[PDB]
């Protein structure tokens, strides 16, 4: 791809410190500020039920792949103009590789 496997352990911790404040990953976990991310790969954006996404996330109709996800983690607002995900971005590809490495793992 344009994405290469990284550290699943490294990623778990990137997640704990940069994504847990607003999200859960497990099947049957709850929606918090952001949606629960279980099964997000291959899924399109704005489809978890019981969660109020913005008009923008929804209309972007993004098919979430390790690659797509990469772009998005760089600069969310950049990738999805008007999204309410208040996250700066992960500029370091290595960081993204790690994080996505875990998400790929944890969200199945």
Task: Cite the annotated binding site by residue number.
Answer: 19, 22-23, 85
Tokens representing 90 are 């992960």
Min. distance of Cβ 4 from ligand HEC in angstroms? Answer: 17
- Please report how many Cα atoms fall inside a 13 Å half-sphere around the Cα of residue 59, on the Cβ side: 7
Residues in contact with ligand HEC, counted by CB under 6 A, come to a total of 25
Residues 40, 41, 43, 49: what is their CA dihedral angle, to the nearest 10 degrees?
-10
Please return the burial class of 77, using the count of CB atoms within 10 Å of its CB with bins 0-12, 13-18 and 19+: middle
| Binding flag, residue 19, ligand HEC (CB under 6 A) | yes
Q: If binding is defined by CB under 6 A, does position 33 make contact with ligand HEC? A: yes
The reply to whether 11 sits near ligand HEC by the rule CB under 6 A is no
Selected from 11, 12, 23, 70, the binder of ligand HEC by CB under 6 A is 23
Angle at the Cα of 55 (from 93 to 38), degrees rounded to 5? 50
Per CB under 6 A, contacts with ligand HEC among 46-105 are 46, 48, 53-54, 56-57, 73, 83-87, 90, 99, 103
Annotated binding residues for heme c, as ranges? 19, 22-23, 85
Q: Is 41 in the site for ligand HEC (CB under 6 A)?
A: no
């Amino acid at each position: 791809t344009e994405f290469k496997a990284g550290s699943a352990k490294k990623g778990a911790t990137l997640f704990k410190t940069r994504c847990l404040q607003c999200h859960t990953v497990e099947k049957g976990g709850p929606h918090k500020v952001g949606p629960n991310l279980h099964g997000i790969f291959g899924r399109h954006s704005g489809q978890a039920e019981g969660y109020s996404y913005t008009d923008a996330n929804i209309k972007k109709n993004v098919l979430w792949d390790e690659n797509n996800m990469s772009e998005y983690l760089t600069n969310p607002k950049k990738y999805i103009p008007g999204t309410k995900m208040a996250f700066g971005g992960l500029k370091k590809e290595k960081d993204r590789n790690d994080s996505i490495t875990y998400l790929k793992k944890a969200t199945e």
